[PDB]
Design a protein around this nucleic acid. Structure first.
Ligand SMILES: [Mg+2]
Lengths: 465, 107
DNA sequence: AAAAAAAAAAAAAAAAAAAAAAAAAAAAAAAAAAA
DNA sequence: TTTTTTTTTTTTTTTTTTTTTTTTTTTTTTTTTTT
C-alpha cells in the first residue's frame, strides 16, 4: 500500500484543502522551517489511521484537531489518504479488485468522528481491521517514531519491546482479541451464572407447584365427568319428549332425595375447585415444560460453546509462542548485524528477562567493543537513536510494513550518521514507503521526493521542492 | 407501569380511539364521558417523564384535531398546552408541538 | 399510487483506557562520632 | 583514619479518579420497492 495522494481538510495547521501528490514509493522526505506543519502532516496520517490516546497527536480533545479549534470558519476536519494497489501481495483482504483505496476520517464540532472508505461510510472497526492487516496499527506501532521519541525507545518497558516483535510476528491482533475475549467471556459468564441461579430459585419451584395443580386438575376433571353424567341424569329425571323416556328406561327408579343431596355435594366441591385450579392448566404445563426443556438445552449448548472456545484459544497459544520464538531469533540476529553495520565495533541483542520467559518481555543489551553494557542508561542520545533505528530496520528485514513514519530521528545523530541513514534508506532498506521529517540536509538530500512545508497567511502549504 | 413502551402504547390507543369516533350519529350520545375522560387523559399525558410519551400525546392530539364535528372547546386547550410545551427539554416534543400548532392553525 | 421494510441518525446512560497526580518505599550521599 | 548510623532528598513504581470517546439500545426519519 504505497501512498499516492494525501488530502487534508481543516486539520490543525491546515485550513484549506491541501492535496499532496507525487509520493515516491521508496523515500519521501518532509522539510521546512520551525512551526511550518510537518508534524501536523504526520499527525494527519496518524489521525486517518486511527488514534485513541490523543497525546500522540498532541491534543486534549477531538475538536482541538480542527483549524483554530473549529472557531475560525472551518468547522470540519477531514483527512483523506489514497493508497495504490499495483502490488497485490501487500493488499488487504477483499480489496484486491480495486486499484486505489481511499480512507477518510471526518470530525465536526460537538460530536465524534466517522470513517469512509472509497466514498462509502464505514465504522471504526472496519478501517481498524483494514489497517491492522498490513500491520499499520497506530495504537501499538512498530513503524512510528514521533518527534522527540527516538532517544526514548530504549526506555520502554519489556512488554512494549515484546509487542514490537509480536506485531512483526503477526500475533498482536490475536493477543488483544484474546484478552478482549477473556473479559467478554467473564462478563457473560457472570450474567449466565445469575441466570442459572434465577432458573434454580424461581422456575422449578413454580414448575412443581404447576405439576401439583396438574394432578389436582385430573381429579377435578374426574369430578367434571361426574357432574356431566350425574347432574344430567338428575335434570332428566326431574324434567319428567321421547328422548327423556329413553334415558329414563335405563335407570328406572332412582331415589330423588339422595340424588339431590349428591348433586349438592358435587356442586360444593365444584365451587371449591373452580377457585382452586384453572381449567386450562394442561396446555399451560405443556408450554412451560417445552420452555424449560429448550432453556436447559440452550444452557448446555452455551457451556459446551465456552468449553470449545477456551480449548481453542489454549491450542492457539502454543502456535503463537512458537512463531514468537521463531520471529525473535531472526529479528535479534538482524538487529545485531544492522547495529554492527551502522555503528562499527558494536553489537546488540534482544534477550528474555532474567529468569522469566521470552513471552514475558524482552530487553535490549548493547556491546561496544568486547564489553557488555549492564545498563543502557549510560549511552548517548545518538547511540540510543542508532539502536532504536536498527531495531526498527530489523523489524523491516523480518516483514516490511508499507509505511515507516520517522519524525526527526536524526536530531541526536552527527553529520556522518545522518548521511549514512539517508544512504541506507535509499540503497539498502528498499521495500517500504518512508515518510521522514528532517531539518538536517544530509538526510533529505539523499531523498527521492522532498516536500517543503511553509506557513503563509494563517495556513500551511506543502510545496513539492 | 415503568416501561415506556406500554405508556406510549396506551397513549396512542387513546389518540386513535378518539380520532376514529368522529362520524356523528353514534358518538356524542352513546359514549360521552368515556371519550371526555380520554380527552382529559391525553391532556394530562403532556407531563410524562420520558419524552416519547409526551410525543405520542402530542401526535394523538394532532390527529384528533383533523376531524371536527364536535369537541371544539378542546381545541383551545390543545392550543394552550402546545404553546406551553413549545419550550420543553427534548427537541422531539418541541417539533411535534410545532406540528400540532400548525395543524390547529390550518383548521 | 400507497404502504412496508431497512438503514441511518439522535439521545441518554454506561464502560474502558490513558493521563495526571499523589503516596510510599528504597537507595544513595554526606556528616559526625568513636576506637 | 575508617566504619557505622542517622537523616534528608530524589527517583521509581503503583494506585486511584476523572474525562473523553466509544458503544449499546430504542426510536424516528428517509428512501426504495412491491402489490
Ligand atoms: Mg515537529
Amino acid at each position: 500500500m504505497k501512498v499516492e495522494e494525501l488530502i487534508i481538510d481543516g486539520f490543525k495547521s491546515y485550513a484549506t484543502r491541501t492535496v499532496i501528490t507525487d509520493w515516491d514509493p521508496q523515500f519521501n522526505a518532509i522539510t521546512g522551517l520551525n512551526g511550518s506543519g510537518k508534524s501536523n502532516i504526520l499527525d494527519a496520517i496518524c489521525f486517518v489511521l486511527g488514534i485513541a490516546s490523543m497525546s500522540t497527536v498532541r491534543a486534549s480533545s477531538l475538536q482541538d484537531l480542527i483549524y483554530k479549534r473549529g472557531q475560525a470558519g472551518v468547522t470540519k476536519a477531514s483527512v483523506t489518504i489514497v493508497f495504490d494497489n499495483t502490488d497485490k501481495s501487500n493488499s488487504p483482504i477483499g480489496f484486491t479488485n480495486s486499484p486505489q483505496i481511499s480512507v477518510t476520517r471526518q470530525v465536526v464540532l460537538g460530536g465524534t468522528s466517522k470513517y469512509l472508505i472509497n466514498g462509502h461510510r464505514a465504522p471504526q472497526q472496519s478501517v481498524l481491521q483494514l489497517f491492522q492487516s498490513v500491520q499499520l496499527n497506530i495504537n501499538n506501532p512498530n513503524f512510528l517514531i514521533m518527534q522527540g521519541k527516538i532517544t526514548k525507545v530504549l526506555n520502554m518497558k519489556p512488554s512494549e519491546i515484546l509487542s514490537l516483535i509480536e506485531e512483526a510476528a503477526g500475533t498482536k491482533m490475536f493477543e488483544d482479541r484474546r484478552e478482549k475475549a477473556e473479559r467478554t467471556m467473564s462478563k457473560k459468564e457472570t450474567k449466565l451464572q445469575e441466570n442459572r441461579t434465577l432458573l434454580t430459585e424461581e422456575i422449578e419451584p413454580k414448575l412443581e407447584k404447576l405439576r401439583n395443580e396438574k394432578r389436582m386438575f385430573l381429579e377435578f376433571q374426574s369430578t367434571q365427568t361426574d357432574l356431566e353424567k350425574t347432574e344430567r341424569i338428575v335434570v332428566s329425571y326431574e324434567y319428567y319428549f321421547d328422548l327423556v323416556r329413553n334415558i329414563v328406561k335405563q335407570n328406572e327408579g332412582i331415589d330423588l332425595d339422595t340424588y339431590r343431596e349428591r348433586s349438592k355435594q358435587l356442586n360444593e366441591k365444584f365451587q371449591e375447585l373452580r377457585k382452586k385450579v384453572n381449567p386450562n392448566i394442561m396446555n399451560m404445563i405443556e408450554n412451560v415444560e417445552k420452555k424449560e426443556a429448550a432453556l436447559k438445552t440452550m444452557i448446555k449448548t452455551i457451556e459446551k460453546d465456552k468449553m470449545k472456545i477456551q480449548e481453542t484459544i489454549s491450542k492457539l497459544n502454543e502456535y503463537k509462542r512458537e512463531t514468537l520464538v521463531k520471529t525473535w531469533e531472526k529479528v535479534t540476529l538482524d538487529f545485531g548485524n544492522i547495529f554492527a553495520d551502522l555503528l562499527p565495533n558494536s553489537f546488540a541483542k534482544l534477550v528474555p528477562c532474567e529468569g522469566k520467559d521470552v513471552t514475558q518481555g524482552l530487553e535490549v543489551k548493547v556491546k561496544l567493543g568486547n564489553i557488555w553494557k549492564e545498563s543502557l542508561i549510560e549511552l548517548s542520545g545518538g547511540q540510543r537513536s542508532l539502536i532504536a533505528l536498527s531495531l526498527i530496520m530489523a523489524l523491516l528485514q523480518f516483514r516490511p510494513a508499507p509505511m515507516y513514519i520517522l519524525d526527526q530521528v536524526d536530531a541526536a545523530l552527527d553529520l556522518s550518521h545522518t548521511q549514512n541513514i539517508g544512504h541506507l534508506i535509499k540503497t539498502r532498506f528498499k521495500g517500504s514507503q518512508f515518510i521522514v521529517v528532517s531539518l538536517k540536509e544530509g538526510m533529505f538530500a539523499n531523498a527521492n521526493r522532498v516536500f517543503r512545508t511553509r506557513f503563509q497567511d494563517g495556513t500551511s502549504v506543502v510545496s513539492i521542492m | 407501569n415503568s416501561s415506556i413502551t406500554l405508556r406510549c402504547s396506551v397513549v396512542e390507543a387513546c389518540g386513535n380511539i378518539v380520532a376514529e369516533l368522529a362520524q356523528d350519529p353514534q358518538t356524542m350520545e352513546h359514549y360521552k364521558q368515556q371519550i371526555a375522560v380520554l380527552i382529559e387523559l391525553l391532556e394530562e399525558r403532556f407531563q410524562d417523564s420520558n419524552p416519547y410519551v409526551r410525543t405520542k400525546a402530542i401526535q394523538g392530539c394532532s390527529k384528533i384535531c383533523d376531524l371536527s364535528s364536535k369537541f371544539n372547546k378542546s381545541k383551545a386547550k390543545f392550543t394552550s398546552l402546545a404553546v406551553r410545551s413549545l419550550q420543553d427539554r427534548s427537541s422531539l416534543v418541541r417539533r411535534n408541538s410545532v406540528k400540532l400548532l400548525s395543524k390547529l392553525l390550518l383548521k
